[PDB]
Amino acid sequence: LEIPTAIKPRDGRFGSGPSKVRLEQLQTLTTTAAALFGTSHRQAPVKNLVGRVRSGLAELFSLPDGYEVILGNGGATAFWDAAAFGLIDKRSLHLTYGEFSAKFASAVSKNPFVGEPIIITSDPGSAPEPQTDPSVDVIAWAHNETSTGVAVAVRRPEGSDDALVVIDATSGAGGLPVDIAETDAYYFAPQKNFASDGGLWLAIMSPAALSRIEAIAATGRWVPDFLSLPIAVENSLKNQTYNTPAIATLALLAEQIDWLVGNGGLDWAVKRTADSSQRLYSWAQERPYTTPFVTDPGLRSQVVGTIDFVDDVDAGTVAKILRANGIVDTEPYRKLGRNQLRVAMFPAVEPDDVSALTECVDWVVERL
Amino acid sequence: LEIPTAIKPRDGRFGSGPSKVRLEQLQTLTTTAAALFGTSHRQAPVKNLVGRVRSGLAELFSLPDGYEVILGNGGATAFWDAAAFGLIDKRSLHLTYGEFSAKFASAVSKNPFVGEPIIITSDPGSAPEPQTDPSVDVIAWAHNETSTGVAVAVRRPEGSDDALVVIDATSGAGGLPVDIAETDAYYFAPQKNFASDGGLWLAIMSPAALSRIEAIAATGRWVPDFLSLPIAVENSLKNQTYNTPAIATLALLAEQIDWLVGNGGLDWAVKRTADSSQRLYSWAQERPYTTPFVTDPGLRSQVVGTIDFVDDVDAGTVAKILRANGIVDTEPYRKLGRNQLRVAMFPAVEPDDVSALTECVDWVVERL
Ligand SMILES: Cc1ncc(COP(=O)(O)O)c(C=O)c1O
Ligand SMILES: Cc1ncc(COP(=O)(O)O)c(C=O)c1O
Question: For pyridoxal 5'-phosphate, which residues are the binding ones (chains A, B)?
Answer without folding.
Answer: 76-77, 100, 146, 168, 191, 243-244
